[PDB]
Design a protein around this nucleic acid. Structure first.
Ligand SMILES: [Mg+2]
Ligand SMILES: [Mg+2]
Lengths: 270, 1097
DNA sequence: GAATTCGAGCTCGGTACCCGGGGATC
DNA sequence: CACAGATCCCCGGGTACCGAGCTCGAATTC
């Protein structure tokens, strides 16, 4: 095998077939950051930052040796290393291997696809093998730390919450969890509330560290656009309040595991 | 006084004083800017040293040399000056009209007055006796004439005698819409019935024609334009000079001559000095029977060359505006004027005309003395008129037979003549070799989509602009005199930009001396280029051969050379050439007929030997071999019915037309005789080269080269739609036979030598030549007159020799005797890129690059240098040539999916190196100067969105130096910043009212000088994308000629970077995040990465 | 209705043609 | 008022589909 290799056959390849399906074409043009922990798939949709982790756990064989290596997903500015996992682009596929060979700064990935031939082993699409050399300089900036509070929604709950905020600079949209645990979002026109329940009706949300109140507000409006452009089926909201620019990450719990990180206005707390 | 008036200033006492106000030493700071401009009542003065003189004074003493005898009606020769003239060189021929009433007092003999009695054309042979005396011989009996079909004019005009035709033409010249020909009789023509044949269409019969014998070309031009416009006049486009040359056998327009005793003992008779028509020492009048060609002498008699160069200053508010000759305040400040001897090539005088005091630097004067050059003579003037009058007085008194300079037809002479006509109103008609009424004109291309070039015609004065010469002989992106000096002479001169000339001019005499230093250096370099290329010798060789004077050789195109030679031959044979452009005289990519066809190349990288069989002089050999001409053609099969199918005539379908050309034993082609006679003549000369002196070897090289370029244009002369004697049947036949010849050669090679046994059977030495692999001899390319034969399984070592035996075999087998296939080259490697594009390495020889934009003038030095580095890797690095050859083992699309072969690592390295040399902020901007020719007047362009037109109109908007038509306009592609975006936006707003985004490359074009003076950044995107584009254009032959695969694979070499943008980078740094790139240190980046993922988990 | 389909409607490059123009090649 | 020819690739600028996405908008409906 390759010095660095990542294999997926079924019962781990079907798992990624669930992960990638809704994501659609956006994240085709991405950054894959591969290391010993897995592949982090970073993109920016409408400016706002998006990451899709796919951990070493989640493959049929993960072997990483070397520094971390970042490949621009697009090969030759037309084809993607991540279109192999588009919902139905290669029907009947069976295996995908990521082979990363070469020396620490200059490695190349080669992505080999295979199909289950009708009653057969492989059709290996040498007409669809992709070969990418790595970036050799990259600085990607990644969410840090644990959240200052986080709030699990089902899908309808989150579709409501997103549908409340406004996608234009004129409205700024505010998220506030006040005392007794009634978590709310609103603007000059819309408002929505839910009741927060701990972990350790249809208008309630389960979360951790709700006792940490907050009241944050959001500008530079892309958030509904993005969490629909990603097709998020409900997910956790998680708020990082500590920062000189506090951050909101909507992490899906869904068949995907995508996450979109947004920034907010500087907020006084404590 | 003189018989004919002298219209050059011999006296002046009042003139228009224009002079910069900064010159007046004592003046206050207020009265220093501007220009004194008013009329002054004194004679023009010239100051040399402490001395002073009237400009127009020809007493003894003078600040410049003189070769004149007369000066405004005073004979300034030593007493008894009466040199005997036998032999004289002739460098130019003028044709003037003289009248017997104008020359009553001139005391000519009766012969000459008879030749001019109302009127007559006098052919003035301008020359030099071997003692150096200037001389004019006036030849008197020549007449111009044309033919009309006798029956045609008889039935159209009811002409019962030749006297009736003469009367009728005289009548029609009386009754012209203007009064241009008043008092013109029927004794001004002389009709005679001759039997001649039209030159076309071999069935054509000899008919009776009137030949008319008019006395002036003005009268001829009128008659041929307006007299019986239905009737076909035959040669009324012919000069009196060409009748003088052709009607006297042996006469030349450029050569030595003799005064004979003539028939009935009539000798040439010298003019009295007052009857002189030219600024010449001695002056004869004769008839052609008094002249003999005087072979035996071949070398020039010490004509003088004047290499000159003006320097101009911009008055007005902006003196950083380029000078404009129309502005009285924008004035010529200096003129360097170098006087060489053309026989010994020795710089004799260095003159610097200066407006204001000028003290040449001592380093400059010491350099001139070190090189043995003459000491400069700085002439100082108070006003511009004094300077320009003094320069024009030099040009008249010295009277250089040749003048030269760099770009003197586009800038210098137009500026001087604009000043002398617009501003000072000096008549320039007598400032040439004639004392008056002479042409002193300059034609720019201007609005003429016909003209290829700007012309200058001074009578008796051969202007050879070295700008045109170097544009013909050397391929440069830029033809600036500094660039040309770097490229041709290896002399790195120092330039003086015009923007510096105001400041220098205002300091005082020393800095004007510095301006004079650059003006003299420019003239000295141009003299060096002139005596390197020796344009006069090859232009005179073509002039001798063509039968035209050297000025027409320089200026009036290719067509008149072939036409005159054809006219001589045709007249000898009893033909006459019809005027049909004379009727045309008031006249996406059109093509008259079908051209050559290029064989579909077997593109790719061929690392086997490739023999190149090419035809020696293909088209002219076809014209000779097949006897093509006007007079052998026959569109009708009726014409040849009395002749045999072969053995008397070829018949061929040329445009779906089924033409017939009779063979040389039925009628020998006139174009064939011209080409054959010249190719025999040239073989004679080229054989005499090796066993003659170096000095005569230089002339003979010029003479044979003249023959070469004269026998290349015969084909195209026939294919000039609306030319002087077109025949698209002959032109299309030549090309049809060429296409058939090329294909026939291919089929022969493929049928004969398909197997090695046949080759060995024809050529035994092939056995010593069999390389290891399997044999094949296949044709991978051919352009018009060559085939490339990929000889797999043979060694390149002995292959041009056997290829010569092969080519001889094919020529014997297939083609007729003047046709000659031959083998000259053998590529050991060849990259066939496209139909006219290839790079090869000749066996034991150079690298040959053909049309791949290494050899095109348009690209920048950066991209061309990188491209040649890559080409040298492909051809010379055995590693890369091995990997490039192994690249053809697979279809190209499998290299997208596979690593490239190993040896190509170096090929990538060049690219990545260029990728980092291009983003360097300290990038030499001259390496990024694209260039493009302004081929038309910019109002003649359909598509006025080119980069060089954007730069053109920017230059005009800034009052910079606007380029001339046919100049190269250099430009750079600037970086598309905020400011450039709005500049283009509001120039669009302003331009369309006169009468997020990516901007076009035409809108990012900028002038490089402007881009330097201002701190404008270059478009690294454009320049790198075009670096990769030129690489992909050339190396797509390696990847199966697929430019989309080639581009992908070439872009893969480039190291790709990804950071989030600067603004968010700063804002996250404020949010505490930090660099994990290479930018500070690798070790710190590693540590930050370790804590950044440990931070993540 | 709430998801939910592919249905219908936008736009947004992509690729390709077409043309003039530069500037080679014979 | 002056005038070799034609062929050919390639690039810049222009247009015109047109499939791919790509969300909205509203019949058919778990
Ligand atoms: Mg000059
Ligand atoms: Mg100059």
């Amino acid at each position: 095998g390759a010095p660095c290799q990542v294999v997926l056959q079924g019962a781990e390849l079907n798992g990624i077939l669930q992960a990638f399906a809704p994501l659609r074409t956006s994240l085709l043009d991405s950054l894959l950051v591969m290391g010993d922990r897995g592949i982090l798939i970073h993109n920016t949709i409408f400016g706002e930052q998006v990451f899709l982790p796919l951990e070493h756990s989640q493959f049929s064989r993960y072997r990483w040796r070397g520094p971390t290596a970042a490949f621009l997903s697009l090969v030759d500015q037309k084809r993607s290393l991540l279109s192999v996992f588009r919902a139905n682009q290669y029907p009947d596929l069976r295996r995908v291997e990521l082979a990363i060979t070469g020396q620490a700064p200059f490695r190349t990935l080669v992505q080999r696809i295979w199909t289950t031939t009708s009653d057969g082993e492989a059709v290996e699409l040498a007409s669809e093998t992709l070969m990418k050399r790595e970036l050799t300089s990259f600085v990607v900036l990644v969410p840090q730390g644990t959240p200052d509070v986080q709030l699990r929604l089902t899908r309808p709950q989150l579709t409501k919450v997103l549908n409340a905020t406004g996608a234009d600079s004129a409205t700024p949209t505010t998220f506030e969890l006040g005392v007794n645990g009634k978590f709310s979002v609103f603007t000059t026109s819309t408002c929505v509330t839910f009741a927060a329940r701990e972990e350790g009706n249809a208008k309630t949300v389960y979360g951790e560290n709700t006792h940490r109140t907050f009241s944050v507000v959001v500008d530079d409006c892309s958030m509904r656009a993005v969490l629909r452009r990603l097709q998020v089926a409900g997910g956790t909201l998680k708020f990082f309040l500590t920062t000189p620019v506090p951050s909101l990450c909507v992490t899906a719990t869904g068949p995907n595991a995508v996450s979109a990180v947004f920034l907010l206005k500087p907020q006084k707390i404590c | 006084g003189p018989t004919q008036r002298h219209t050059y200033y011999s006296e002046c006492d009042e003139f228009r004083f224009i002079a910069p106000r900064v010159l007046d030493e004592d003046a206050p700071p207020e009265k220093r800017a501007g220009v004194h401009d008013g009329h002054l009542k004194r004679a023009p003065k010239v100051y040399c040293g402490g001395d002073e003189r009237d400009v127009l004074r020809v007493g003894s003493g003078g600040f410049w040399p003189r070769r004149s005898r007369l000066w405004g009606g005073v004979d300034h020769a030593p007493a008894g000056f009466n040199p005997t003239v036998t032999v004289f060189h002739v460098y130019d021929i003028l044709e003037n009209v003289e009248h017997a009433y104008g020359m009553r007092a001139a005391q000519f003999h009766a012969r000459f007055m008879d030749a001019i009695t109302p009127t007559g054309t006098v052919i003035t042979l301008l020359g030099l006796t071997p003692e150096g005396h200037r001389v004019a011989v006036h030849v008197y009996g020549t007449r111009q004439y044309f033919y009309m079909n006798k029956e045609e004019v008889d039935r159209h005009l009811q002409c019962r005698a030749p006297r009736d035709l003469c009367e009728r033409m005289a009548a029609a010249l009386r009754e012209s819409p203007g009064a241009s020909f008043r008092g013109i009789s029927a004794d001004h023509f002389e009709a005679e019935v001759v039997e001649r044949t039209d030159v076309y269409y071999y069935e054509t019969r000899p008919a009776l024609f009137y030949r008319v014998y008019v006395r002036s070309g003005r009268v001829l031009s009128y008659l041929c334009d307006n007299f019986c416009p239905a009737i076909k006049k035959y040669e009324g486009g012919v000069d009196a000079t060409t009748r003088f040359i052709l009607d006297n056998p042996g006469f030349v327009t450029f050569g030595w001559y003799r005064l004979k005793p003539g028939r009935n003992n009539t000798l040439a008779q010298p003019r009295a000095p007052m009857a002189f028509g030219t600024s010449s020492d001695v002056e004869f009048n004769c008839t052609a029977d008094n002249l003999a060609i005087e072979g035996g002498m071949s070398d020039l008699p010490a004509y003088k060359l004047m290499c000159f160069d003006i320097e101009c200053k911009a008055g007005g508010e902006d003196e950083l505006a380029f000078p404009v000759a129309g502005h009285p305040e924008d004035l010529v400040i200096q003129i360097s004027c170098l006087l060489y001897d053309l026989s010994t090539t020795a710089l004799e005088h260095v003159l610097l005309f200066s407006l204001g005091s000028c003290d040449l630097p001592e380093s400059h004067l010491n350099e001139l003395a070190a090189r043995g050059l003459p000491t400069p003579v700085v002439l100082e003037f108070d006003s511009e008129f004094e300077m320009l009058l003094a320069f024009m007085t030099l040009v008249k008194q010295y009277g250089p037979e040749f003048v030269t300079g760099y770009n003197i037809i586009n800038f210098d002479w137009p500026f001087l003549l604009a000043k002398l006509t617009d501003i000072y109103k000096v008549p320039l008609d007598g400032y040439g070799r004639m004392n008056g009424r002479g042409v002193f004109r300059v034609w720019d291309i201007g609005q003429s989509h016909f003209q290829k070039r700007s012309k200058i015609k001074v009578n008796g004065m051969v202007n050879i602009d070295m700008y045109g010469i170097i544009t013909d002989k050397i391929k440069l992106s830029s033809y600036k005199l500094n660039a040309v000096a770097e490229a041709v002479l290896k002399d790195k001169k120092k330039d003086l930009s015009y923007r510096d000339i105001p400041a220098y001019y205002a300091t005082g005499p020393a800095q004007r001396g510095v301006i004079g230093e650059y003006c003299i250096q420019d003239s000295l370099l141009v003299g060096q280029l002139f005596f390197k290329f020796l344009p006069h010798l090859e232009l005179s060789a073509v002039a001798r051969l063509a039968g035209i004077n050297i000025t027409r050789t320089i200026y009036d195109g290719q067509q008149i050379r072939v036409f005159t030679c054809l006219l001589r031959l045709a007249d000898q044979k009893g033909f006459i050439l019809p005027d049909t452009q004379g009727r045309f005289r008031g006249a996406g990519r059109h093509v008259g007929y079908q051209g050559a066809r290029v064989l579909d190349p077997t593109s790719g990288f061929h690392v086997n030997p490739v023999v190149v069989f090419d035809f020696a002089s293909l088209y002219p050999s076809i014209i000779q071999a097949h006897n093509l001409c006007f007079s052998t053609l026959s569109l009708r099969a009726d014409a040849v019915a009395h002749l045999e199918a072969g053995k008397d005539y070829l018949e061929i379908e040329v445009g779906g037309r089924r033409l017939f050309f009779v063979k040389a034993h039925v009628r020998e082609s006139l174009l064939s005789i011209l080409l054959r006679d010249w190719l025999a003549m040239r073989k004679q000369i080229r054989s005499r080269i090796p066993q003659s002196s170096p000095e005569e070897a230089v002339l003979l090289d010029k003479q044979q080269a003249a023959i070469k370029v004269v026998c290349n244009s015969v084909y195209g002369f026939t294919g000039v739609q609306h030319g002087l004697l077109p025949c698209l049947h002959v032109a299309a036949t030549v090309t049809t036979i060429g296409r058939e010849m090329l294909l026939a050669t291919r089929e022969y090679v493929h049928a004969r030598w398909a197997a090695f046994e046949q080759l060995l059977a024809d050529f035994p030495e092939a056995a010593d030549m069999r390389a290891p692999g399997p044999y094949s001899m296949r044709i991978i390319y051919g352009d018009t007159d060559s085939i490339f034969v990929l000889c797999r399984g043979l060694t390149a070592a002995g292959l041009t020799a056997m290829g010569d035996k092969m080519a001889s075999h094919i020529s014997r087998a297939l083609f007729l005797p003047p046709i000659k296939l031959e083998c000259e080259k053998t590529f050991t490697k060849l990259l066939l890129i496209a139909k006219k594009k290839y790079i090869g390495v000749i066996y034991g020889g150079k690298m040959l690059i053909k049309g791949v934009d290494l050899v095109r003038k348009n690209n920048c030095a950066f991209i061309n240098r990188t491209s040649r580095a890559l080409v040298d890797l492909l051809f010379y690095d055995d590693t890369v040539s091995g990997a490039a050859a192994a690249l053809a083992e697979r279809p190209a699309e499998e290299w997208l999916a596979r690593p490239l072969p190993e040896g190509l690592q170096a090929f990538g390295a060049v690219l990545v190196d260029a990728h980092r040399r291009i983003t360097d902020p300290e990038r030499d901007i001259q390496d990024f100067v694209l260039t493009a020719e302004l081929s038309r007047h910019p109002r003649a362009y359909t598509n006025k969105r080119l980069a060089h037109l954007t730069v053109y109109y920017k230059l005009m908007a800034r009052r910079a130096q606007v380029p001339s038509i046919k100049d190269r306009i250099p430009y750079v592609i600037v970086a598309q910043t905020r400011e450039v975006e709005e500049t283009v936006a509001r120039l669009a707003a302003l331009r369309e009212l006169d009468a997020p985004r990516k901007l076009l490359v035409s809108e990012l074009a900028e002038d490089p000088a402007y881009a330097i003076a201002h701190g404008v950044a270059l478009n690294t995107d454009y320049y790198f994308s075009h670096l990769l584009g030129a690489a992909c254009v050339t190396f797509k032959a390696l990847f199966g000629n697929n430019a989309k695969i080639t581009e992908s694979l070439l872009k893969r070499f480039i190291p790709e970077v990804w950071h989030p943008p600067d603004d968010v980078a700063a804002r996250l740094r404020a949010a505490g995040f930090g660099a994990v790139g290479a930018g500070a240190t690798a070790e710190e980046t590693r540590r930050m990465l370790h804590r950044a993922f440990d931070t993540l988990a």
